[PDB]
Design a protein around this ligand. Structure first.
Ligand SMILES: *[C@@H]1O[C@H](CO)[C@@H](O)[C@H](O)[C@H]1NC(C)=O
Ligand SMILES: *[C@@H]1O[C@H](CO)[C@@H](O)[C@H](O)[C@H]1NC(C)=O
Lengths: 50, 50
C-alpha cells in the first residue's frame, strides 16, 4: 500500500501549519477521522483550497 | 484578548447544540505558557501536564 504519512491535527485549524499539511496531501484516497462538524470544517477548507 | 468570544449556553434547558469553540478554548489552554508560581514554573505540555 502506497501510504502517505499521517497528517495529524492536534487542535482547531490555525490555517498556517494545517494549510501546509493540506498542501502535503497529494494522494488519491483521503481517510478522515474526526467528528461531524470538524469534517464539515475540513471539507470547507478543502473546497476553499481546491 | 482574542476575538469572537462564545459562551456555553444553558444546555440543561432545551439546548443540545454543542459549544463549538471547545477545542478553540482548549488550544488557548494548550499555549498557556507561564513562569510565575509558588509551586514552580507551571506549564502545560502536549498532553496538558506539568
Ligand atoms: C467570529 O465572527 C467574525 C465575523 O463576525 C469572523 O471573523 C469569524 O467568523 C469568527 N471568528 C474570528 C476568527 O474572528
Ligand atoms: C522547581 O525547581 C526549579 C529549578 O530549581 C525552581 O526554579 C522552582 O522554583 C522549583 N519549584 C519549587 C518547588 O519552588
Amino acid at each position: 500500500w502506497d501510504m502517505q504519512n499521517v497528517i495529524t491535527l492536534d487542535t482547531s485549524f490555525e490555517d498556517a501549519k494545517t494549510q501546509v499539511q493540506l498542501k502535503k496531501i497529494h494522494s488519491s484516497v483521503i481517510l478522515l477521522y474526526c467528528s461531524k462538524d470538524e469534517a464539515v470544517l475540513i471539507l470547507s477548507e478543502a473546497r476553499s483550497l481546491g | 484578548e482574542k476575538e469572537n468570544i462564545t459562551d456555553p449556553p444553558r444546555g440543561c434547558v432545551g439546548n443540545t447544540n454543542i459549544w463549538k469553540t471547545g477545542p478553540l478554548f482548549k488550544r488557548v489552554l494548550m499555549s498557556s505558557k507561564y513562569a510565575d508560581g509558588v509551586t514552580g514554573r507551571v506549564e502545560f505540555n502536549e498532553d496538558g501536564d506539568r
